[PDB]
Structure formats: structure tokens, C-alpha cells
Assembly symmetry: D2
Homo-oligomer: 115 residues x 4
């Protein structure tokens, strides 16, 4: 995959499963244009978002939907999304994995960029 997203639930110690992930690319008018979307697997992973061709240099926002994810724990999070922004491909084509460890009022995200 040119772009993979992996989401972990840092409260329960488990993959974040079936969580909506929307990816955007900064457009000509400075707004965020919808780029790719999916839901995380049983493993907290979202593969197949994009193709090498579609995935040109630019600024991308990964939006993880955290709104009702910790409803059952009875806490409303700091925000309805966990967002990670990265600047891409900005020296030829590379594979990205965006790994996010999520808690309601914290998060740790790491971009692993390969090739």
C-alpha cells in the first residue's frame, strides 16, 4: 500500500476496529478535498486507500472518527476526530504508514515512511 493507517485503542489495549478513516488532500483553494476513505479492519488496519499514481506530492490529512468510540467508557473526547497531517512524496514516491495510538484526551501518532 502507498498509504496505510493503523489505529490502536490505548485505553482498552486493542486494535480500534471498524473505525471510520477519511483522508483529504489540500486543494488549490486551500480547502481539504476528499481523497480516500475506509474503515479499519479487525487488526485496526486500513489498507487499499489509494494507488501509487493517485498519491501525488501534497499535504494530506488523515481524519480518524473518535466521536462515539469511547461512549461506552462514558467519556467524551477532546475532539470528534483524531487528525494527523503529513507532507508527502515530496522527494519521489514513498510508502506511508500512519500509526496512531489513541486515548480520549491524548494521542501519539507516528508516520513511518519507507523507500
Amino acid at each position: 500500500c502507498p498509504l496505510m493507517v493503523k489505529v490502536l485503542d490505548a485505553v482498552r489495549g486493542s486494535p480500534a476496529i471498524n473505525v471510520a478513516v477519511h483522508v483529504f488532500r489540500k486543494a488549490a483553494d486551500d480547502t481539504w478535498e476528499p481523497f480516500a476513505s475506509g474503515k479499519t479492519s479487525e487488526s485496526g488496519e486500513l489498507h487499499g486507500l489509494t494507488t501509487e499514481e493517485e498519491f501525488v506530492e501534497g499535504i494530506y490529512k488523515v481524519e480518524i472518527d473518535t466521536k462515539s468510540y469511547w461512549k461506552a467508557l462514558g467519556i467524551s473526547p477532546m475532539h470528534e476526530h483524531a487528525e494527523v497531517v503529513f507532507t508527502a512524496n515530496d522527494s519521489g514516491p514513498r510508502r506511508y504508514t500512519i500509526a496512531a495510538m489513541l486515548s480520549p484526551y491524548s494521542y501519539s501518532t507516528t508516520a513511518v515512511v519507507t523507500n
Copy 2:
């Protein structure tokens, strides 16, 4: 302060000093409206961003300048900013400390929300 931003450099183990920070509030047309800015102190802190009356309910983005911060380490970071989005107040006044532990390809960020 109604809003304080604290920035640590996780690579060198030191406050991130003289780092530019921009705060935005989500406006009616879905643009980010400039809200406050400044540079971090010797302790990595940015105090005095806003007043309790100016700190109205809304969605806020904190944008920490990272572009050339690790230039001396010879590393280009994942993005020119580290960004944190939070949804504010909703319940009477609250004070927010946004704490960010930064490396070129990872960051951890926590919103501490009190009274």
C-alpha cells in the same frame, strides 16, 4: 490562562524554545480564523494567548511550527507543523493546557482540561 501551550523536544530532552505557535478557531464557512499566536518561552510554554471572554465556544486548531526546528539534526520532519484540534468549553469556563511532545516523525499530544 484560559489556553496554554507547552512544547517539549522529545529528541533532545528539552523545552522547545522560541517556537512559533498559531491558534485558529473554526468559522462559519469552515475556514480557520486566526485566533492568537506567539513563540514559546525558555520553558517551552506560551502563556497569555487569550482571555476567558475571548475564549468562546468553538473548535480550535493549535499549529506548532516544526519546519526548521530539527534542521540542525539533519532531518526534515513529517510536516511543517505539529497540529492539535480540540473542541472547546461546552459547559461553563474551562482552562486548557495543550501539551505536545515532538519528534520529526511522531508526536504525542494531550489536552488537560480543568474546572
Copy 3:
């Protein structure tokens, strides 16, 4: 302070208050010798642990009690402590701040070392 410990609750977005912190130093027999202890303040901070003289070079472990800290959330954590080990003082006095942002199955720690 020569050594300060600050603990944040990353699930609720608040300082972790009145949490027991024990500090140990690696002894002659490779065991952990009790060094200092206290409880975090209302700000999640623990000051006054040690003195510049007592705080010699060596290997130190900060043990944060997390056993029953999230009991009210109904999750048992990955372990009864959050532990940070650091190697100290290679030169003369350094002041350490150990910042720990804690979730039941994740934690981010950072050591800020200042001269």
C-alpha cells in the same frame, strides 16, 4: 527541583492527582534501592523529592502507581505501575523533569533534562 515528576491522565484529560510515586536507584547488588517517594499534587506534579547532593549519578526508576487509578473506568491496566528508567548526571547537576501522560494500555513519557 533536581527531580520533578509530572503525571497526566490521558483518558480523562486532567492531572493525575494524589498518585503515589516511588523513585529507586540501582544499588551495588543490582537491586532497586528506595530513593525518594511522594504523591502528586492537584496539578499532577511531585516536587521536593530529593536534593542536589543526594541525587548522584546512577540509574533511577520512577514508579507511578496506576493499579486502581482507572478502577472507576472499569479497566484494569497493562500493569500495576507505569515505570520510567533514566540514566543520570553524567557531568554535574542536571535538573530532571519526568513527564508521563498515562492511559491503561499506553503511556508516553518524556525526560526533560536542563542545565
Copy 4:
């Protein structure tokens, strides 16, 4: 695997490759008994540490060797290891992935515990 360790280099945005990892299990005299070891793969992963039956209930320490890992950056880290302690395998069998995002003066670790 009953136990997998995955290590990422948060400074360079890469897997931490060929990094030594030591696992210990807490023994009755309060000593850490060596349990398993190895070095991370090209993906930053260390698989094959243990078997379901060897991975008995107990307290485990994972020790990732960081001493010289950022030597090329010219930084000496906060400690010669990044360490994670976890209390294991209550409630029948569970598989653990210990995921560590490392920088010289910070790390984020997560235990992902699943029931197979």
C-alpha cells in the same frame, strides 16, 4: 506469536532495524529471569520470542537496546534501554504485541492484548 515486539524510530520515521530486545519474567526472589531475546527485523518486528505454553502467567519486562541507536544523530538517549513492563496472561490465552515508538528522550509504548 504469543508475544511480538515492534519498534519504530520516531526521529527518522522508520522501523528500528537490527535493534536488540531482551525479555525477562519476574522470579520469586524479585529477580528478572531471562526469558527470550533477539533483534528486530527490517519491519522493526521481533517475532518468534516464545510459545503459547512457555508464555506462562507472570510479570514481564521488555528491554529495547537504545544506547548507540541514535549515535549517528549525535545524541545520547535518556537511558541505555527503552523498557516496558506488563502483567501477563491472566484469563487463559492472550497474544501480546508491545509497540514502542522511540526517541532519545521520549517514548510511547502500547500493549495490544487480544484473545484468540
